[PDB]
Ligand binder design. Structure first.
Ligand SMILES: [Mn+2]
Length: 664
């Protein structure tokens, strides 16, 4: 059923993805790398005291605070949803091998019984209405770029001046590049404007993953994570194999002489992709305006900030269903990419821009190093982009692609199982747009709050309510997928964007509250994804610029968890046992040092002004900018803090670009 073509790095098609400079050449050849991360300055993730601390703390918390999740997956009582063993990983050392990314997900979708297009004309109108409401009356804004971020293929530059020039030039030449692609001249568009080529695959650590303790044996068991070998990936699963990666860490002793305590494992690794920046720039120039529109006009459904901000909406509901989606990015459908492009053309968007967008969602992928002695292979032919990888993580609008797919998918699930009486309001495009516009503003008896693959579905009192309960019961039974589009189930311990929905004895939205997930506090403080990069002088370019600051926002973020105090005390006690020092004093010192370091980066902060003006969000973001790529957005951050982390291209240049893209 068509194996994707594959080319070794030595092949000219792969060589052309890397410019003639040392960084790009090194990225092309980089071999498998592993090693302990520097968890905090001077502390390695495999330090024997640190592991002893994690062993004691994870056992203690699990023993004293067993999960409180009912049969319907609602969290109550102590606010705990699983054991605390997820922290038992040797951070920096990956499971082996990581997966080869699937070149085509068509068979994966068909075999999971998911549809190859909108099932009914109503659904077709709703997906298209989503495109019309999201992309219509957009306002230009400057194109912001993360400081220190890479341009990936083909230059691999991390220099801000170079990145700004690449982006400006890309906005100037996107039209000529898109028209070349409309003529089938992808090699020309790539050679002349670097628009095309491939995504560059980097494997990221998912630092904590499930682990259970077998009461029978007293031995810990890590969750098996299935990975595809090369044959499987290039044949869409027709050949080759899907098998459990090895998380066994015993090897670290033999290989590096690192002591491995019982029940500690190698980390789960996930594929992540960096896009060719010249192609992404023109897409980001439209995506940000779209985010601004949906987070303002449709803030009810899409703009989520604090626990209370979420709580206000959910408290008004009579029923709240916390859904889960299996493997969202890999199952994301290429037919939606095509439906979206078709609808943008219908709205009058420039064809050359739609073509760039379409191409960014069919691009080849260059696999670097999934394991020792493996990799350095290009999947797909850049001369004619035709992959179906699902949704690429580094595409310039991935968050929006997942949000559009899922928001309509959940609305369809509510229509299908609970509100057939609303079907008559969706007769054609005009009526579909009116209905979706009202639904997204939270004005219908069926509602939702969502972001990509996380969501909570709601029902107020009314005719749909009774159906809502049957849908919830169908999810609980878990025998039939309620959607024809993606694999949907209910979340075990319902949460939304990091906050757990804590129910009381009534088990009703009206008396439930959103609280911080104490397990996420533990993940962030003791299993960060990256080391502190103490050798990177410019802190704003680090993955974790000011780790100490999170101590100042901790109470605000996690204080409402029922066992907040208990956890902080267990930490103090266990850290004393392991290090013979106070964890609280250690964090207070780090907070002081980082607060002083911060004033050097903030123009408005006096040589030692302090943190008085900063919000909890500001602090969480400065300690972990990653939260700005999955939890919050630019407007949620104080302006002077956003500037520490991001730089932009002039709105004058983007304003002119946008005028040439958008309809009349
Ligand atoms: Mn959730």
């Amino acid at each position: 059923p068509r194996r994707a073509p594959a080319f070794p790095l030595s092949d000219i098609k792969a060589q052309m993805l890397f410019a003639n400079n040392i960084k790009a050449q090194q990225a092309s050849k980089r071999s498998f790398k592993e090693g302990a991360i520097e968890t905090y300055e001077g502390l390695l993730s495999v330090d024997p005291r640190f592991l002893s601390f994690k062993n004691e703390l994870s056992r203690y918390l699990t023993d004293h605070f067993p999960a409180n999740v009912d049969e319907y997956g609602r969290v109550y009582g102590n606010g705990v949803r699983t054991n605390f063993f997820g922290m038992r990983h040797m951070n920096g050392f990956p499971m082996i091998p990581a997966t080869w990314p699937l070149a085509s997900n068509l068979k994966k979708r068909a075999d999971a019984d998911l549809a190859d297009g909108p099932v009914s004309e109503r659904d077709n109108l709703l997906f298209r209405a989503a495109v019309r409401l999201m992309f219509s009356d957009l306002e230009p804004v400057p194109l912001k770029i993360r400081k220190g971020s890479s341009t990936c293929i083909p230059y691999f530059s991390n220099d801000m001046g170079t990145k700004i020039e690449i982006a400006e030039r890309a906005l100037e030449k996107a039209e000529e590049a898109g028209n070349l692609m409309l003529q089938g001249k992808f090699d020309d568009a790539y050679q002349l404007h670097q628009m095309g080529g491939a995504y560059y695959v980097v494997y990221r650590a998912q630092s904590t993953d499930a682990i259970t303790l077998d009461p029978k044996t007293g031995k810990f068991v890590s969750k098996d994570r299935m990975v595809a070998d090369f044959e499987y990936a290039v044949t869409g699963g027709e050949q080759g194999s899907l098998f459990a990666a090895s998380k066994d860490a015993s090897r670290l002793k033999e290989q590096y002489g690192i002591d491995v305590p019982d029940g500690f494992f190698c980390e789960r690794r996930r594929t992540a992709m960096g896009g060719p920046f010249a192609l992404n720039a023109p897409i980001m120039a439209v995506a940000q305006p779209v985010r601004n529109k949906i987070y303002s006009k449709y803030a009810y459904t899409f703009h989520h900030t604090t626990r209370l901000n979420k709580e206000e909406k959910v408290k008004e509901w009579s029923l709240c269903v916390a859904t889960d989606v299996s493997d969202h990015d890999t199952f994301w459908p290429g037919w939606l990419r095509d439906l979206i492009c078709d609808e943008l053309l219908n709205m009058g968007y420039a064809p050359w821009w739609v073509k760039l967008f379409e191409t960014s969602l069919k691009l080849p992928v260059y696999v670097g190093a999934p394991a020792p002695e493996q990799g350095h292979t290009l999947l797909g032919d850049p001369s004619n982009p035709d992959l179906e990888v699902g949704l690429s993580s580094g595409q310039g609008a991935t968050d929006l692609m997942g949000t559009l797919l899922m928001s309509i998918t959940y609305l369809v699930m509510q229509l299908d199982h609970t509100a057939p009486h609303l079907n008559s309001r969706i007769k054609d495009m005009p009526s579909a747009c009116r209905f979706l516009d009202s639904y997204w503003q939270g004005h219908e008896e069926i509602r939702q709050i969502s972001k990509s693959d996380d969501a909570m579905l709601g029902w107020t009192k009314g005719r749909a309510l009774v159906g809502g309960h049957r849908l919830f019961e169908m999810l609980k039974e878990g025998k039939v997928n309620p959607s024809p589009y993606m694999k949907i189930s209910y979340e075990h311990g319902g949460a939304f964007l990091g906050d757990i929905l804590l129910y009381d004895s009534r088990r009703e939205p009206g008396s439930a509250i959103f609280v911080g997930n104490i397990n996420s506090m533990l993940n962030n403080q003791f299993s960060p994804e990256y080391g502190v990069q103490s050798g990177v002088r410019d802190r704003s370019k680090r993955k974790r610029p000011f780790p100490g600051l999170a101590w100042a926002s901790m109470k605000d973020t996690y204080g409402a968890c029922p066992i907040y105090s208990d956890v902080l005390e267990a930490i103090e006690r266990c850290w004393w046992n392991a290090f013979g020092e106070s964890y609280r004093a250690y964090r207070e010192d780090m907070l002081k040092r980082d607060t002083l370091e911060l004033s050097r980066y903030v123009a408005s902060m006096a040589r030692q002004a302090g943190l008085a003006e900063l919000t909890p969000i500001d602090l969480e973001v400065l300690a972990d900018p990653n939260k700005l790529q999955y939890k919050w957005t630019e407007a949620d951050v104080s302006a002077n803090i956003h500037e520490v982390l991001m730089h932009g291209v002039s709105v004058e240049k983007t304003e002119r670009f946008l005028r040439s893209v958008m309809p009349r």
